[PDB]
Amino acid sequence: MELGAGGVVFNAKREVLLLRDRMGFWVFPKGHPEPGESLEEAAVREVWEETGVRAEVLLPLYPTRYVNPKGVEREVHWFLMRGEGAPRLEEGMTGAGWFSPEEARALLAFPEDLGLLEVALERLPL
């Protein structure tokens, strides 16, 4: 099992930050933690690296699990964050943007991420 760390980032308009990967799936930004990094610290870094968005962690969510196309099981730990700014795609990505919850529900590729979105919304401060 390979650990991952990422963020469910919202802006002041309560829109969520989504990214479209190389396989064309809309998901949340996440990546591998470096040795010595807390998962929260790694999530903030991955968000910045993959979307060019500076975010601040509000509170922890919960981990999701799945097996990627290469047969590797992943356990990604998520954090609710707040951020602003236009996104920037890093090499590999096929899309990125801010989305209303309604739009996200219609774009997110996986069930694990839909539930994550709803819980994040329940805990997002007004």
Ligand SMILES: Nc1ncnc2c1ncn2[C@@H]1O[C@H](COP(=O)(O)OP(=O)(O)OP(=O)(O)OP(=O)(O)OP(=O)(O)O)[C@@H](O)[C@H]1O
């Ligand atoms: N809930 C889910 N259910 C079923 N399949 C899911 C899924 N989520 C993603 N996939 C499927 O796995 C792929 C991403 O691989 P990943 O294992 O999450 O890993 P990644 O290989 O892109 O690796 P990261 O941890 O994101 O990589 P880094 O950001 O650290 O970049 P690096 O490897 O260059 O350091 C998606 O393209 C989709 O097909």
